[PDB]
Write a protein that binds this DNA or RNA. Structure first.
Ligand code: K
Lengths: 231, 238
RNA sequence: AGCCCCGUAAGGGG
């Protein structure tokens, strides 16, 4: 029950573009085989990188060999890039784990999340850019239950979606440039579940850990909703 | 009919403290109006601000009776010393000539122009009460409901139920920028300070006028819980 | 994140 976030370190002028990255990824999916992956990209010009998250084993085993085979090779992610390395560790945004390990802990009443790219949500046939507890966490829990081994008990789900508040928020909305008339939140938000039982706190820490892989909200396949947990 | 926001230009050092400022204000009401301390919905809002050495305090009144019964005492404070936490001398009592001073009427809140958009600046920490817990994210419904509720409470008109639905259920966020800051109440919490542009899509012009009115009302009523302490001070921007 | 009270339980008052 492995999960993986593979970082492609890129050599080339310019920066990767979401439509190119997604289309390029879809090519590999056609060749090689709710979304069980997510995409991202980041860094500055000349120090850019792309990332592929894989949320189910079938996909890791299918795609990972195929990302490795591109080391040293030139791909198009908008502009042309030389993939200098495929990283599973040694990059802040690269990692590998298992589902059970998401439940490591320690359990905490608080969950600090950094939103590294514009995050928004589909709601009432509209894109909403505010990182409200219930959105962040329903989104995370929906995917974790979809690809993980556990279904949250109903009381726990209730606690997370109906009870979690915000302790602190810091940030701003930015344009989502692939979209018409859509903004997304960037910055930091610390969520707090009061009266959290140990189990609830555990589930909350797990959702926080899963965010790093699955990301948060809508159009993660375009690199939106890229998030990670912090101390 | 009338809304008024009077600003006390303060002399002395530091800033007013929330609990001291509210203490001071209920001190003044104890003689004219001891009923309001226990009323679940406040016919007023307090505020303070400024750099240190240029501090000011704010008394906002949402019903005429209080203005009548309170304004004279307030004006009488010119020249004299008040305790708003730290002691200050009251230098002036302004209705005009200060950014947070003003007067208007309820009808005049509704004189447009009506906009599908309402940009609010939250100038002091803004937060809300939900399930015995504090929530500092200014969601469309939380803000507009708190404005609308108090408009209906103290004002001459209630919005049609479809306009209410449009405002509450279908208004969204177009832009948000800011951060939470500490907020001392009877219990310590935090609240949002910064700027949010709200947008009601498919708004009828009526709805669009009610939205602009709520925006205008915010200047006197502030937003959310504990405006009695100076929290939720806000105003509409362009 | 916690006390008291209120509350077509949404949110409010101290
Ligand atoms: K009161």
């Amino acid at each position: 029950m492995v999960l993986a976030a593979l970082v492609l370190v890129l050599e080339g002028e310019g920066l990767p573009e979401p439509l190119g990255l997604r289309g390029f990824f879809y090519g590999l999916l056609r060749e090689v085989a709710e979304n069980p992956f997510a995409l991202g990209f980041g860094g500055r010009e000349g120090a850019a990188w792309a990332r592929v998250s894989l949320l189910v084993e079938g996909l890791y085993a299918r795609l990972a060999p195929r990302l490795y085979a591109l080391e040293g090779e030139e791909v198009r992610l908008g502009p042309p890039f030389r993939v200098r390395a495929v990283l599973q560790e040694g990059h802040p945004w690269a990692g590998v784990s298992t589902y059970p390990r998401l439940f490591q802990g320690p359990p905490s009443r608080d969950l600090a999340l950094r939103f590294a790219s514009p995050t928004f949500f589909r709601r009432k046939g509209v894109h909403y850019p505010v990182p409200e507890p219930r959105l962040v966490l329903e989104s995370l829990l929906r995917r974790l239950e979809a690809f993980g081994p556990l279904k949250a008990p109903e009381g726990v789900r209730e606690a997370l979606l109906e009870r979690t508040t915000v302790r602190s928020l810091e940030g701003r909305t930015l344009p989502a440039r692939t979209e018409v008339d859509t903004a997304g939140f960037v910055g930091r938000v610390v969520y707090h579940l009061p009266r959290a039982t140990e189990e609830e706190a555990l589930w909350l820490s797990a959702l926080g850990r899963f965010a790093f892989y699955s990301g948060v909200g809508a159009k993660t396949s375009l690199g939106y909703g890229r998030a990670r947990a912090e101390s």
